[PDB]
From Swiss-Prot:
This is Plasminogen. Converted into plasmin by plasminogen activators, both plasminogen and its activator being bound to fibrin. Activated with catalytic amounts of streptokinase. Plasmin activity inhibited by SERPINE2. It catalyses: Preferential cleavage: Lys-|-Xaa > Arg-|-Xaa, higher selectivity than trypsin. Converts fibrin into soluble products. Keywords: Blood coagulation, Cleavage on pair of basic residues, Disease variant, Disulfide bond, Fibrinolysis, Glycoprotein, Hemostasis, Hydrolase, Kringle, Phosphoprotein, Protease, Repeat, Secreted, Serine protease, Signal, Thrombophilia, Tissue remodeling, Zymogen. Gene3D superfamilies: Hepatocyte Growth Factor (3.50.4.10), Plasminogen Kringle 4 (2.40.20.10), Trypsin-like serine proteases (2.40.10.10). The gene is PLG.
Amino acid sequence: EPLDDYVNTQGASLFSVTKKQLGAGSIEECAAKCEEDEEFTCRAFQYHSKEQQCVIMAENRKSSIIIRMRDVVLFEKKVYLSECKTGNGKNYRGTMSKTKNGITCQKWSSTSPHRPRFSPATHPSEGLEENYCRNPDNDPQGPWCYTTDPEKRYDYCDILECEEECMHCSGENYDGKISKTMSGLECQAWDSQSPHAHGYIPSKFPNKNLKKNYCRNPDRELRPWCFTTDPNKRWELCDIPRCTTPPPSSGPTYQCLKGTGENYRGNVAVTVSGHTCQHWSAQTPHTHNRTPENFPCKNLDENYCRNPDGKRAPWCHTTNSQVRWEYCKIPSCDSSPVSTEQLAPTAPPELTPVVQDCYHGDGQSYRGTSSTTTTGKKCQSWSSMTPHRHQKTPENYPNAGLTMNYCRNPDADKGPWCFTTDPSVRWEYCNLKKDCMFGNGKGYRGKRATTVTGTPCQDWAAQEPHRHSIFTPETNPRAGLEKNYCRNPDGDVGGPWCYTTNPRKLYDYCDVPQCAAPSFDCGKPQVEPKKCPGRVVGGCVAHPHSWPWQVSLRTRFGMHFCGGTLISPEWVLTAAHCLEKSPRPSSYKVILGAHQEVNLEPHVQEIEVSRLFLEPTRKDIALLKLSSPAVITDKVIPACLPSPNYVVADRTECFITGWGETQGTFGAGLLKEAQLPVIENKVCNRYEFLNGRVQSTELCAGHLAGGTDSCQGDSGGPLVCFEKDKYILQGVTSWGLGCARPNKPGVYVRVSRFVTWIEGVMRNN
């Protein structure tokens, strides 16, 4: 199959020895454009995917120094990662770190130990690089290394033996082939809209490796697992033949102080706390969670003790119990750690609401990612975090050429860019720089075709000038992408542009401006918005209506406890957890536009939802449809189509609009906010924490480290999809009460389960 040698964690490239450059637009086309040349089997490759420009580097991290950006990808085919062979040799590209007897980096092309068997040029495509391990001479033994010590070579210690169905070395090698279970039942597809309305096809975050249904165990359970086809068993332990080896050697170790702290040679253990601790002859008879036989020979000097994980010191036991997480504190020149890595957001709106007159045209193409602006001010010194707040720093990616005060290419989107130190623009240029649209394509039921080049583009089904195998319009057909009509697949916040009739460049815009849809569009900030990092409970801020997509859901007198969402001139979604108990007549209440509790003002929509509602089954998905049509206004925005058959994104953040209580100032008044991601598929439904206490067909949100759901008042708001570049909809925000309950969010309500009335009544009212 054309896919089965790719596994990468991304964001890198290099200042390589020699370099090469081509183009392509699809993934199967690789099998007729990349492998066909003899020049090398690419030890790194660099396909900048969004604009068909493609690159490759003749040498890699095994021989040269690194660079990084967003969308910049040191692709490394599993051949150059092949820490193995089986049988007489086939793909081995070892790099072995540290043996029983202390071998590490020394080279093939060294004439010592014995008359030179290989050097990098001695075959054109088997990679006889520096020290790095190979099966070259038809010599069938496989794992061995050339060394400073002649004594012996071929034996079954550093010959690793990957029985690939479970753990070896770090336990990351979980790319197994089996799928079967302890019960003898079988496991659900991720590959259709039945039996269940969802799938895990490869265009989602790659480190999951979720191919079809084979064993994935990313958090290392004691036995493998996943979702049974049977919705009664639902998910369960996977079951397999036995395991033994594990083929360990001297393995991995750190070269500077990111490390575990195991190597604590010290002749003491001192702290301010006490006197002395445990020589485990003291185990008589209280057994301890660590004892010396599980550290078999590791410098336990009678018993000056030795580190059991965490950081740079011992923290073991004493016959007293004051604090067991007391580490030793010996004064010495040990170490200098700092916080680390990842991400790129906190971006500015570049002053577009009536555009500040310091930008030109639609930026039709600039030789990579760039269609970018020229608003133009002062650059960031990349050896300081400066100036105004943004989520990450140069010392997150330090080896990427980021020494001196080097101006260096950051994260691709603008083209060659620098963090611009000014309120009018937060990024610009790297300091050594040499039938028309609904707007965003999602279900654009139309057929204009313009470029700024004027006339129609190419049809994406066609193979001249641009070409594809997979990405035919028919392959992604849900509202039609046929013929030479306009389609932005980005649906970009920058507006409609397309992979034009113009060959081999970024895009082109229409001849045509965006027709207006504000305050009825899916959920757009039209004045492009301010943003801040969140990850504080309740709310750091209560902004003047830049969250305008607001309905408040209220008692019979009109006191405030819930929220809500318009979805047409009469259609609405809200919560119901004050309802959700008895099928009464008109008096429970809804307000359309109060960003606040009792403190309304008369510009808000204040015709009550006299015609309350609840489903043919009572569920909190209340379409509190308006009696009348709405009285829409700019600080009171509907969502729209609450559709089934869409699916939410994953691991990234969702959001809720929050009419909850304050915590830390005045006791009542105003709406606050929460940003909150997808939870891992092994939390609620599981043996330890709960054993199945909640009905998982409702949709959640929650961090890797705490938050809320929709609190009081937050309830019922637009259940905002962060998809197709600006907010749209899946379900309604459910209930809410009880602020800040640590790491315990709650319900949001799905539409497909009750669709015959939930999407039914809202037809053309």
